[model samples]
Target chain A: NDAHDLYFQIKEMSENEKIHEKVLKAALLNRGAESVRRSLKLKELAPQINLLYKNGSIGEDYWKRFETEVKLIELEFKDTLQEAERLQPGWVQLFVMVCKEICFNQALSRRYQSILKRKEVCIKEWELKINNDGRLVN
Target chain B: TLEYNANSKLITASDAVVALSTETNIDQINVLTTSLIGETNPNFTPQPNEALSKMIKGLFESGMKNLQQKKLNEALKNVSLAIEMAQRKRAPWEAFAIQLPELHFMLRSKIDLCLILGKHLEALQDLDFLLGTGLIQPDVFVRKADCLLKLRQWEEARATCERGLALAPEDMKLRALLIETARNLAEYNG
Candidate 1:
């Protein structure tokens, strides 16, 4: 009946809406920021990048370029933040601050997971060593 | 400039993380970010022809049924057939845009079947395809690493573990494999 079509339509639309939000949040949060937002985001992400670099996960070329990019983006941020706030009052700064928090949490979440994982790895290694000393001697 | 994109599909978070962490070009980060934000228009969904869609669905159903019955060979054949047929479709097919998850599921099922069949090389081939498609699932890495280990490609296994760790540092299996691969490499070198 007419009721069936309308009911399924709403159901389908609701499911689609859920998918959109799930996809958007995941994709958006993983990505680097754009334009003026890049300046603030790199500030949050640079330390993680440095950590990767120091740990030899990334190359020297990346570290050098990363440093250069930060210097340039920071110079632009000093000028752009003033102009942006003038155009939108406090909203621009508010948004930037929120973005900072978001990036910080995202970076911290990865670091926390990594630290726990390393501890887990160490425990597993010790378990193997203790349980298999005789086997290793062979 | 977030807006609807007709050509975009879902990219996994770990895949994005891997790309961001390894990317050498700073400007490319913004480009990748912009592309990642490009959302497929929900109002429109391109679908495959009805006959092709029905055949694909039927194959998947039978494939799962076979798997449940422990008919490993039949299950593998059915899924492989479905994957082949679906990939032959050139866009403008019914639900083509959203077909990735189904394809991903079929590939995973096929990989598992290959593993059970002791078709390690076949499983490795499927894993290579999976990783190249921009979906960095840790299970794929773990499985591929396992396959390389069995094949005794110790160095290759080590690199696979490293790549997996870069994307999913918390993956316990990848971590374990890294240590194992390193030990194997060391013994050989020594």
Candidate 2:
């Protein structure tokens, strides 16, 4: 009965709550506390970084340093993605029917498996988005 | 002193790194530390650092010779030396980093060698580092996606293709690759 309302509504669990901790920890341990807390960029700026590299704006030495920080940032992001995937469950797989804040079980893993086979098996289509180079936007 | 930014988006990350370096924030030290290394224009005249230049010339010449003779390891070795020399913090190379196209060639050659030698992981690592430097074109993303695809990581490869499409939305190759990746994911799951 409630499926109609849920169709238009997309559920969101912001990283600010959960993944932020992982990012903070990544910086705190690998780089430092002050280095991460406020300085971590809200979005991945890959295009702009490339722009800086192309024009005579930034040189090689800084690029190497930028490379290291980016690697760390990527590491943190991937680490966060795994934790957050409890909600996301990626694209291709059947939507893992998760309840509450956490705690998913085996039954929900493939719950709708044996129903009437006439549904034609609708798949969740995901148009993945990226802002810069490899940062997942959608 | 206060400077007004036109928009919330950072037009110049290098500039932000500079301004942040001068701020009173506690992370100032590391921010500035990284920022100073990125300083593209310094007060001094723009010339390649002499000491590193001296080192690279020898390596550059050797790398060329080795490349022509098909001695890839020696070529890669020489190329690596030149890049390392250019990147060395001990010399004035830091200030001259932007002006060193030779170092970029060294990197490109090394990347090519790694790819040819079947070191896709290392090549991907090099691509990541190079892509981060802002020294990129849309094609580099394809290269990264190719490397990821070679590793059989379908999701990451798909993401990489998306990244390439982001850079060049109309690019047919990446869009095609994205389709291939999606198919691979579907197949892998089934």
Candidate 3:
């Protein structure tokens, strides 16, 4: 449903040649920064879910840097999309898809890294994950 | 001044000896000597010794005879062997340098021929080897782009052509190829 809503917003922007800034503003106000922050937090949390599955150890400082980079990437994507919307509203769909894909790939890479790190710990666990998913399952 | 003339004659004689030793056929030896004479600079004098002259003539006779017969594989093998022997004998750097161009020319010609024959994968492998050795030039990239284009890898072709253009901005042929590749990709993706 959220995807559908975003899709329509993008379609409307494409048709109108201008971002419905009022709609975007209203949505941001209604949803609030807390909700936006929570979404980012969830994205950050999803990578850790794989880390837990792999049972790899990482220092708090390393995680802090990782989280910071992830947050920065998200912020940059959001800003770029907003600017793109203002310049050529029709590109909103393309921008959204690209940004979403980037986030997806980042999440996937984080999981892959966790799995690879774990493989050096328990060889059996590595074999199990590979057998289950045809990949490092983490 | 007399020594210069004598040296030149010795060099000529050495060429004839090498030609005769390698060709075994009088006519072929004559043809080879004539070709060499035509190519040799008239203004330059040769410092020739019996041993060096014999070796040079032997190498040319073997290498050129094989090459003329279109036995490139044999030509390279013999030339490379001669080069190795020369190196062992502590041949002059200038003499060794002459072999470098022949080696490169043979290798590149072989690769180009493979590509022309539609042995694309072989050509690409050879190109990859050349690139790995840091021998990649604009022409090499253009060849790679063309091969990839033939394989319908439009994006890769465009990217490769772009790399070539980055190196040689004034290369119109590369520019045209890149533009054509980009246009094809735009059409396909659009």
State which candidate has the highest lDDT: 1
Residues A1-138, model 2: lDDT tens digits: 211111112112112212222222212222222223213452356568778888968887876787777677566534434434543335112111111101111111112122223121311122333344233343
lDDT of 3 at A126: 23
- Tens-place lDDT digits, model 1, residues A77-116: 5544554454344545343543344344333223323443
Regions of candidate 1 where Cα sits further than 4 Å from its true position: A1-138, B1-45, B89-96
Complex DockQ per candidate = 0.04, 0.02, 0.01
Instruction: Write one digit per residue (lDDT tens) for candidate 2, span B42-89.
Output: 232223356656766777788879777877766776776676555443
Interface RMSD of each: 18.3, 23.8, 34.9
Q: What is model 2's interface RMSD? A: 23.8
Q: Which digits, one per residue and each the tens of the lDDT, describe model 1 over residues B1-190?
A: 1122334432222233434343322222233234335435322223334666688889889888986687887788888788777754322113423555666878888889888877665577667766765578778889999988876678789888998899878877788899899999999899
Please write out the lDDT profile of model 3 over residues B1-190, one tens digit for every residue. 0010222211112242343222222222232233234334422221222575467458756775865687655565565556445433321112322433443554576566566545554456556555654476888998888877765678778888988989889997898898889889999999
TM-score of each: 0.43, 0.42, 0.32
Candidate lDDT scores, in order, read: 0.56, 0.48, 0.49
- Per-residue error for A69 in candidate 2, Å, reads 24
Poorly placed runs, candidate 2 (over 4 Å): A1-138, B1-47, B89-102
- Give the chain A TM-score for each candidate: 0.35, 0.26, 0.31
Flag regions of model 3 displaced more than 4 Å.
Answer: A1-138, B1-103
**Model 2: docking quality category:** incorrect
